[PDB]
Amino acid sequence: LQRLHMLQISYFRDPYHVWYQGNASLGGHLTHVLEGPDTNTTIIQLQPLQEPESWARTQSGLQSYLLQFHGLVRLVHQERTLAFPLTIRCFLGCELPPEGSRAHVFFEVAVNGSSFVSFRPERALWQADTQVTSGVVTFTLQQLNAYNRTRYELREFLEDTCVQYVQKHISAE
Ligand SMILES: CCCCCCCCCCCCCCCCCCCC(=O)O[C@H](COC(=O)CCCCCCCCCCCCCC)COP(=O)(O)OCCN
Ligand SMILES: *[C@@H]1O[C@H](CO)[C@@H](O[C@@H]2O[C@H](CO)[C@@H](O)[C@H](O)[C@H]2NC(C)=O)[C@H](O)[C@H]1NC(C)=O
Ligand SMILES: *[C@@H]1O[C@H](CO)[C@@H](O[C@@H]2O[C@H](CO)[C@@H](O)[C@H](O)[C@H]2NC(C)=O)[C@H](O)[C@H]1NC(C)=O
Numbered sequence: 001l002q003r004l005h006m007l008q009i010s011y012f013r014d015p016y017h018v019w020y021q022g023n024a025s026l027g028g029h030l031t032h033v034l035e036g037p038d039t040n041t042t043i044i045q046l047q048p049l050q051e052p053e054s055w056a057r058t059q060s061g062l063q064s065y066l067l068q069f070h071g072l073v074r075l076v077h078q079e080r081t082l083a084f085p086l087t088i089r090c091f092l093g094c095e096l097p098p099e100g101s102r103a104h105v106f107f108e109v110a111v112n113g114s115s116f117v118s119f120r121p122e123r124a125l126w127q128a129d130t131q132v133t134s135g136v137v138t139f140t141l142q143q144l145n146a147y148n149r150t151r152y153e154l155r156e157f158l159e160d161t162c163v164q165y166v167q168k169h170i171s172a173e
Contacts, residue, residue, distance in 0.1 A: 001027055002170050004162050005093035008034060013085045015074045020066070024093075026166070027173040034062075041066060049169050068150070072143060080139045086112055092119075094162035105158035117141060124155035 008022040020041055022034030031049065036042045043059050050058060069090075076082060092107035107119035108129070115129035117140060126144040128137050144151065 001095075001098075002166055003027065003093060003095035004166050005091070006032075008090040008092075010069070010073075010088045010090075011085065012073060012088070015077045015082070015084070018070060018073075027170055029173055038066075038070060047172070049172060072140075075143065076136060076140055080135045082136065088116075089113075092158065094158055094166060096163070096166060103159065103163045105162065107154065107158060117144065119151075119154065119158075121155050121158050124151045126151070 004024060004026050006022065006024040008020065011019040011021075013019075016038075018038045020034050020036060020038075023030055024032035026049070029047075031045060031047050033044050033046060034041070041063065043062050045055055049055075073082070073088070077084075089110040090107065091110075092105075094103050094105040096103055105121045107121065109116045109118065116137065117126050118129050119126055126141055128141060130137055
């Protein structure tokens with residue numbers, strides 16, 4: 001299993017040009033696709049799990065996550081100098097264990113194939129997964145952990161929205 005996993009791969013050839021490739025699976029079955037350049041990013045449910053008005057709402061929130069994700073990469077480069085091209089991998093989701101009182105939720109980010117940062121969702125705080133210190137990772141963490149709604153919203157998305165989605169739709173699988 002009872003889980004929703006989401007994968008997003010973002011290839012930046014420079015701060016203003018990104019190619020997205022992603023997908024999500026519910027209970028081990030492919031259910032959603034993310035594809036295309038920043039200029040036209042398509043997000044589709046392969047199975048008709050949400051009715052059109054509810055999907056439309058889900059999709060605008062996903063597009064707004066992408067806009068902010070891209071904005072943060074541009075901001076990091078603008079303050080600390082990223083080396084392009086680069087590939088960012090976001091792997092996130094929620095799982096209901098059979099022997100569990102509580103969902104396991106996660107959000108891990110890799111850059112160029114190596115561990116970069118990950119979310120500690122209960123405290124709604126990000127940590128470095130690199131043991132290597134860097135101005136890039138320090139600045140990225142300073143932005144991610146700022147006292148604004150963004151990290152508390154992400155916690156709600158993983159702990160509430162994702163979990164309720166699994167509880168509602170896992171039957172249809
Ligand atoms: C169950 C519903 C979904 C159904 C399944 C759909 C799957 C279709 C697509 C395939 C998978 C693609 C990946 C999707 C991931 C995004 C998920 C949404 C995230 C999101 O909405 O976050 C909002 C906060 O934004 C943020 O948290 C912004 C964060 C910005 C930074 C990103 C963190 C990574 C670090 C950046 C790298 C920097 C690198 C520098 C070198 C909170 O939700 P909401 O209120 O908007 O929506 C309302 C619902 N809660
Ligand atoms: C997103 O799609 C990719 C590509 O189909 C999935 O990765 C494959 O997963 C299968 C089954 O686990 C493996 O046999 C392949 O080796 C994987 N290929 C690659 C290139 O990684 C991935 O599991 C999907 N993720 C989600 C959350 O749906
Ligand atoms: C991510 O990986 C890419 C490709 O491996 C890196 O791009 C290289 O950057 C070096 C500078 O050290 C250039 O000499 C090469 O021309 C680039 N390779 C290409 C264009 O294929 C990029 O620097 C890496 N970035 C991070 C942040 O790890």
